[PDB]
């Protein structure tokens, strides 16, 4: 996925979980949540981008 497309979609799914309640309800910016999560997962070697 091109990075921007990926992060936007991620922010979308994260909204499915602000509609959830049991893990980190974003109420400031789901897009910001997507950014931070992508940062972490890259940091965990999960996802590497060329």
């Amino acid at each position: 996925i091109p990075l921007e497309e990926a992060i936007q979609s991620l922010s979308s799914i994260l909204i499915e979980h602000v509609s959830q309640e049991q893990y980190d309800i974003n109420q400031d910016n789901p897009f910001l949540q997507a950014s931070r999560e992508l940062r972490e997962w890259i940091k965990r070697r999960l996802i590497v981008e060329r």
């Binding site: 921007e4 497309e5 992060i7 979609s9």
Partner: protein, 50 residues
């Protein structure tokens, strides 16, 4: 929200005011860069850039 609305606020104040209102607003998303905007759109229409 309308082009006229945004132009009105723009004359009222800078993009600072724009994004402050967007925070206050709903059903709206600013994008101080085009690529992010385009990602958002392609998200909302289930279509690739092609």
């Amino acid at each position: 929200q309308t082009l006229e609305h945004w132009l009105n606020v723009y004359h009222e104040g800078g993009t600072r005011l724009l994004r402050q209102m967007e925070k206050e607003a709903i059903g709206l998303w600013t994008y101080p860069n085009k690529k992010q905007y385009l990602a958002r759109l392609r998200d909302f229409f289930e279509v690739g850039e092609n």
